[PDB]
């Protein structure tokens, strides 16, 4: 995603 | 007034702010001219095919003249090659040469509209309409109007102003056939963005108040409201099938730009409520309908029986469409209000209210899997009222005997969609992975 | 700038 | 897991060494590819019946996981049906501008002539030699300018084709100087500014020494020439 | 909100 | 091209003060 | 049709087109010879046809080219590159979302009969069998290509049991069992139908429906055992999936091959 | 001042009416050609961005407008990351006009961001999208891409390769598709894959309307990366030999006048005496006109030394009995090319026996005097033009024959  | 200012568009440098002054006088009080599609369509390519084209195809072309088109077209059923062979010189043609061809066209699409006729000759008199429509737009949609009429008065250009929905007077074969509707989409929102500068010009004349601009805000979003209105109903199938699909898309394709340009008309239509078996083709077709989750709750809270049916069963195929936890949010608060009617309806009104929203039930479920314990106990609730009542006044198919497993009474219909839904939800289930 | 219905 | 959470750590620390961070996650996901098949529901977010929203496309860390996952992808098969519809089109832009980090895939929506011609057009001029000046002239001009065009075109034949345009700049240069009108007027007038000749004659000398000494590969008989 | 751009579309973070 | 290049006699080619001269002197049209 | 004009052909291409404004008017069985047979300009002219041509002539054309006709009169490649054409036109697609749609969602489909897709199956596996030189690798890509028209063409549960109960006899040259091996894209649960697959016994390299799902147990199974209300389902489906069917399980062993390595953390395992 | 008018501007902008914001917007490229200054530039560029951005789509086709016109001021723009960013932005709207609108914005911007790789994704996948007006905008901005980049190029010639063998999209579409190929010289590999590429086109669709932007695009693509010249020669005198279409014929004039005046050193004998022959052969006075005029450019440049170098005499090349019998012939044009081709092989050439040829020249001359003297056409005073060229170059090349001609322009007085 944008951050795991 | 249109070719000049794409002339305008040309010679911008030279002219300092001429092209900014008619350009902005022409966005305040000719709409209908200005529209987005007949600018992009004349901005065209600049892969030059058209200009090569024309210099190596026009030469001489044997003197194409709109009186042989007429004597051709006048035996087009014993001539179809002879005519497309001049229309398709005349897409050769350009722009500003096209002009002595307007009459023909026009006033001669009938034998058009008749079957047995090649699109390829449709689709030339389309693009030739498209080129003359970012000619000279105005008498070119009064001719198209005058000529559309059904097999006749003459309408005006007043006229076409004080009533659009004239465009919709025209044939079923009309709407039935694919690029002459395009055509007729076309003058169809000119019209109506007509119509707005044309009422707007008669209440700033007739001044010589405040309730005058609220009743221009009402018949407007009417006017409108009831175009779209007219173009769903001809999305609706006919009764002879019991070409479709390409019309189907074009009132798409126009309906969504009308939902773009003004989200306020998407709430009308949807508070006015239209035929749901146009619902769900629509929902595949315009993608600008997700607004819906904003105002759905307002139209459940309507207090109106056929508006809170429409409200479920929009809200069941939007949740098939996009699943959103906005529209989970949403699908709770329905499923909570489908239990409130069920605590308040009488008999009568409990099978016309709850006859036609179960598939939206099943709908509910093929979204959210964890909106599904709340379904189960719903419908079971719905079920056994249905069988008391069953159970109050004597019967004869008797469902309770029927347990181990045309026209009849309203709670023995109930009893049967409800187990018929809940056959359908565990079919699902299973092959639904 | 009617933007429901009127009595709700 | 750890270990890409913390290159994680490093990428949003440092963001510079991005490129060093993709190529070893690239040589991971080529290394041992079937470690990472449980992680996939996990790494990016696919609730498991929502429309999750669509990543964002140029943000390093999404870059990040992405090509680990396509070099992952790369032998095991089972997970072009584990992957979304944003994770399809990014596949398709990702091999589309970084092509030696991702791989090639099998997903359902992605399924000596300038030499000969450079010696071609010097011949032409060799043999053209025994014609009119002004003829010369056009000649001269014509496929200068052409060998110009050919070291723009091409890269490995560009030091050659600029080599041969030089000389035959030069060559045109000295016969302009020749065909000049002074020798047409008599002697002892030279009157002034007439001097495309001396002019001609400075060029020529500076072009010279810029055809011997800047370029890189010659030899004695090409430095005769030039002598 | 948003009745052009889609849910399933990214943000414009400024 | 043209037919003759040192053409001292052509319209559009001459400048702005015998163009002043061409305005007077066509406005005046004679010679005695 | 009968002539071998090279250069001239084209002014006979431009005055047939140009005269005939549908491209089946008169004789359309002749039209139909030239459109496919057992040349050059075939691929513009079926261009021609497949944008320039009406409704009912389009489902007649389609009618007779997949019916019953043993005689193989009709070109493969040109008349499924047809077909394909046809599911795809624009015009049918004009307005609608494109490039994000749901996966689950499939909206509509060509509708074929009993004997049509028989004819369909049969003429579409005949091409698969020429083989030039395309060999089982590019045979097997072939059939990747044609594979979605067949899956939107059946579209049925009764389509999809007729054409898997539909096997030829032989042994060479089958591709039966490609086609069997594609049962798995076909998401049916039928043992009966794995058992010829099973004794067909070719390897899995395409991609497979139930995948997702398998994976779903799989890591379920690892998590309840990492974790150790998911144990019941971690140990029951997924054993009576592998039990339904082999070839999934056995495509999808390398994850659990590379699974259960916490051996090293706890050797003593008290 | 500068910065008075950009505010006033500004507040246009912010104003309620779109007809208003369509004023400022169209106003600023009268502000971009009044002051040059880069920071002015670069912040009125990032408010188009913004309202591009947020606005009512005929704001957006007025911007883009604007960019279309004051482009040349595109260069001196420094936050280009947030400008693309914005104009980049609105791409994923649902609103297929909104796409094509912001595609053909990104091919004006072709001149500043000729790199952008998710710029060249978005347009491949738009290429192949169903929406007919985004897809014919995608092709536009295929077409600018494709001329400032160089990998852009190779991506979207193997996409075209499959589209067009692909068979789907009308014909057309195919040709909105195919002038994307004129801009593949940026390498002769790309240049010959381009080139068995269109090969294939034309043997694929022998239809007038495709083999007339097919050798077009063709023939511009061989200009620009001249490394096949000569296969795009013998490639256009065999289909003005052997295709019958007279329109493609007439292509085959108006492309060889193109090569004939571009790179004329290139002609060889070969292909002079190939449409030396094709112009004896032919029947029609007017596809023979355009061959003469071919003939005529290509005597006037150098080739004709080529045509007439040795290691068959002159008389016996095939060059001179056309010549000959076309300066003769009746028809007006005809003769004077005839006359030109003449002029410019006696002043040009200098063997032995071309005496016959200069008396011969200057009789079929005077010729042409008399039938342009007494003709009085507008295209009969440009034949007497061309002939009083032949004239003025004849007798300043050769002072041999002047007393001769001043004598027969006498007797013409």
Same mark, same amino acid.
């Given at each position: 995603?944008?951050?795991? | ?99 002595? /061809? ?156 009308? /939902? ?13 409520? /239209? ?46 469409? /996009? ?111 | ?8 | ?227 | ?14 | ?32 | ?223 309840? *055992? ?18 339904? *069917? ?14 259960? *390595?916490?051996?090293? *953390? ?5 | 001042?500068?910065?008075?008018? %950009? ?46 951005? &947020? ?192 329109? &493609? ?8 006048? %193109? ?110 005097? &008399? ?43």
């Amino acid at each position: 995603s944008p951050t795991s | 007034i249109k070719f000049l200012i794409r002339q305008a568009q040309g010679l911008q440098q030279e002219l300092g702010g001429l092209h900014s002054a008619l350009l902005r006088l022409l966005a305040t009080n000719y709409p209908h001219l200005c529209i987005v599609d007949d600018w992009i369509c004349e901005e065209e390519i600049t892969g030059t095919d058209a200009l090569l084209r024309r210099m190596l195809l026009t030469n001489n072309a044997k003197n194409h003249s709109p009186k042989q088109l007429q004597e051709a077209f006048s035996a087009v059923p014993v001539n179809n090659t002879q005519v497309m062979q001049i229309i398709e010189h005349l897409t050769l043609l350009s722009a500003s040469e096209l002009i002595p /061809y307007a009459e023909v066209l026009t006033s001669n699409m009938s034998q058009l509209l008749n079957s047995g006729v090649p699109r390829r000759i449709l689709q030339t008199v389309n693009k030739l309409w498209m080129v003359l429509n970012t000619v000279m737009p105005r008498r070119l949609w009064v001719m198209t109007v005058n000529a559309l009429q059904p097999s006749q008065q003459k309408y005006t250009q007043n006229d076409l102003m004080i009533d659009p929905l004239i465009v919709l007077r025209c044939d079923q074969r009309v709407h039935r056939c694919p690029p002459l509707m395009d055509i007729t989409l076309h003058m169809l929102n000119g019209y109506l963005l007509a119509s707005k500068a044309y009422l707007s010009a008669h209440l700033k004349e007739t001044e010589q108040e405040v309730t005058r601009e609220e009743l221009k805000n009402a018949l407007l979003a009417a006017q409108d409201s009831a175009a779209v209105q007219i173009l769903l109903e001809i999305c609706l199938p006919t009764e002879e099938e019991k070409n479709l699909r390409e019309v189907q898309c074009l009132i798409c394709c126009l309906l969504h730009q009308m /939902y773009i340009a003004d989200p306020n008309i998407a709430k009308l239509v949807h508070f006015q409520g /239209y035929p749901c078996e146009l619902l769900p083709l629509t929902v595949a077709g315009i993608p600008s309908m997700h607004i819906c989750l904003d105002f759905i709750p307002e139209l459940i809270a309507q207090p109106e029986l056929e508006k809170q049916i429409f409200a479920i069963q929009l809200l069941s195929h939007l949740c098939i469409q /996009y699943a959103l936890p906005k529209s989970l949010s949403v699908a709770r608060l329905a499923v909570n209000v489908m239990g409130t009617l069920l605590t308040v309806l009488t008999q009568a009104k409990r099978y016309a209210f709850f006859m036609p929203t179960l598939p939206s039930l099943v709908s509910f479920c093929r979204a959210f899997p964890p909106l599904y314990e709340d379904i189960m106990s719903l419908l079971i609730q719905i079920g056994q009222v249905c069988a008391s009542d069953v159970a109050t006044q004597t019967r004869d198919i008797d469902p309770i005997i029927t347990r181990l497993q045309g026209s009849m009474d309203p709670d023995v219909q109930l009893c049967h969609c409800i187990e018929r839904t809940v056959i359908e939800i565990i079919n699902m289930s299973v092959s639904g992975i | 700038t009617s933007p429901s219905y009127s009595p709700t | 897991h750890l270990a890409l959470v913390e290159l994680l750590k490093n990428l949003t620390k440092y963001p510079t060494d991005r490129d060093s961070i993709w190529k070893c996650l690239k040589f991971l996901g080529s290394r041992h590819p079937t470690l990472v098949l449980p992680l996939v529901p996990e790494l990016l977010s696919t609730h498991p019946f929502f429309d999750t929203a669509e990543p964002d496309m140029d943000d390093p860390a999404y870059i990040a996981v992405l090509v680990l996952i396509f070099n992952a992808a790369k032998t095991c098969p089972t997970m072009p049906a584990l992957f979304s519809d944003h994770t399809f089109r990014h596949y398709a832009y990702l091999r589309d501008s970084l092509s030696h980090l991702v791989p090639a895939l099998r997903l359902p929506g992605r399924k000596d002539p300038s030499q000969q011609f450079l010696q071609q057009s010097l011949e032409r001029v060799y043999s053209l030699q025994h014609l009119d000046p002004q003829g010369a002239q056009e000649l001269l001009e014509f496929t200068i300018r052409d060998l110009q065009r050919l070291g723009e075109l091409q890269s490995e034949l560009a030091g050659v084709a600029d080599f041969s345009a030089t000389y035959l700049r030069c060559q045109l240069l000295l016969i302009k100087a020749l065909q000049e009108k002074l020798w047409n007027v008599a002697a002892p007038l030279y009157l002034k500014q007439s001097d495309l000749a001396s002019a001609a004659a400075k060029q020529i000398m500076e072009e010279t020494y810029k055809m011997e000494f800047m370029y890189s590969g010659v030899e004695n008989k090409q430095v005769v020439i030039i002598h | 909100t948003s009745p052009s751009y889609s849910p399933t579309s990214p943000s414009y973070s400024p | 091209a043209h037919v003759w290049e040192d053409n001292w006699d052509d319209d559009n080619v001459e400048d702005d003060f015998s163009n002043q001269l061409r305005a007077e002197l066509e406005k005046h049209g004679y010679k005695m | 049709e009968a002539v071998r004009l090279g250069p001239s052909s084209g002014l006979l291409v431009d005055w047939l087109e140009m005269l005939d404004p549908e491209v089946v008017s008169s004789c359309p069985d002749l039209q139909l010879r030239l459109l496919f047979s057992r040349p050059s300009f075939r691929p513009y002219l079926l261009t021609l046809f497949t944008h320039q041509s009406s409704w009912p002539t389009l489902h007649q054309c389609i009618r007779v080219l997949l019916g019953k006709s043993r005689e193989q009169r009709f070109d493969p490649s040109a008349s499924l590159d047809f077909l394909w054409a046809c599911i795809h036109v624009p015009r049918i697609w004009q307005g609608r979302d494109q490039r994000t749609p749901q996966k689950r969602r499939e909206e509509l489909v060509l509708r074929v009969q009993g004997p049509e897709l028989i004819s369909l199956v049969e003429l579409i596996l005949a091409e698969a069998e020429t083989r030039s030189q395309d060999g089982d690798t590019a045979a097997c890509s072939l059939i990747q290509a044609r594979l979605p028209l067949l899956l939107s063409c059946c579209c049925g549960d009764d389509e999809s049991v007729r054409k898997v109960t539909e096997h030829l006899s032989g042994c060479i040259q089958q591709w039966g069992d490609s086609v069997l091996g594609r049962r798995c894209r076909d998401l049916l649960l039928q043992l009966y139908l794995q058992r010829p697959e099973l004794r067909v016994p070719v390897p899995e390299v395409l991609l497979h429906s139930e995948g997702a799902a398998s994976s779903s147990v799989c890591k379920l199974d690892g998590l309840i *055992h990492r974790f150790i209300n998911r144990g019941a389902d971690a140990s029951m489906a997924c054993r009576k999936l592998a039990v339904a *069917h082999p070839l999934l399980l056995l495509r999808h062993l390398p994850m659990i091959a590379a699974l259960l *390595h916490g051996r090293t *953390h706890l050797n003593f395992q008290e | 001042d500068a910065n008075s008018a %950009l505010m006033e501007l500004d507040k246009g902008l912010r104003s309620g009416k779109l007809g208003e914001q369509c004023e400022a917007v169209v106003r600023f490229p009268r502000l971009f050609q009044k002051y040059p200054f880069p920071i002015l530039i670069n912040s009125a560029f990032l408010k188009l961005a913004d309202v591009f951005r &947020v606005g009512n789509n005929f704001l957006r086709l007025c911007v883009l407008k604007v960019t279309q016109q004051s482009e040349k001021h595109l260069e001196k723009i420094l936050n280009v990351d947030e400008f693309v960013k914005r104009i980049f932005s609105v791409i994923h709207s649902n609103d297929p006009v909104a796409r094509a609108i912001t595609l053909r914005m990104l091919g004006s911007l072709a001149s500043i961001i000729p790199e952008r790789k998710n710029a060249h994704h978005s347009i491949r996948q738009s290429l192949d999208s169903h929406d007919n007006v985004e897809v014919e905008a995608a092709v536009f901005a295929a077409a600018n891409f494709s001329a400032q980049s160089k990998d852009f190029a190779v991506g979207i010639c193997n996409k075209i390769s499959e589209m067009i063998q692909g068979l789907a999209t009308p014909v057309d579409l195919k040709l909105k598709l195919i002038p994307i190929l004129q801009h593949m010289h940026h390498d002769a590999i790309l240049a010959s894959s381009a080139r068995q590429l269109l090969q294939q086109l034309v043997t694929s669709y022998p239809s007038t309307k495709m083999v007339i932007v097919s050798l077009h695009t063709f023939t511009l693509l061989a200009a620009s990366s001249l490394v096949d010249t000569p296969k795009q020669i013998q490639l256009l005198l065999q289909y003005l030999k052997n295709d019958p279409r007279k329109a &493609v014929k007439r292509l085959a004039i108006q492309d060889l006048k %193109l090569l004939a005046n571009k790179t004329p050193h290139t002609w060889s004998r070969e292909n002079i005496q190939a449409l030396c022959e094709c112009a004896l052969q032919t029947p029609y006075d007017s596809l023979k006109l355009g061959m003469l005029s071919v003939l005529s450019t290509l005597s006037g440049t150098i080739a004709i030394k080529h045509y007439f170098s040795i290691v068959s005499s002159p008389r016996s090349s095939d060059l001179v009995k056309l010549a000959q019998e076309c300066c003769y012939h009746n028809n007006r044009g005809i003769a004077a090319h005839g006359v030109r081709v003449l002029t410019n092989i006696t002043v040009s050439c200098q063997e032995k026996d071309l005496l016959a040829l200069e008396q011969d020249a200057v009789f079929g001359l005077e010729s042409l005097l &008399v039938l342009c003297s007494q003709d009085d056409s507008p295209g009969a005073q440009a034949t007497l033009k061309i002939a009083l060229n032949c004239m003025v170059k004849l007798a300043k090349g050769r002072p041999h024959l002047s007393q001769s001609v001043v004598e027969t322009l006498l007797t013409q007085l």
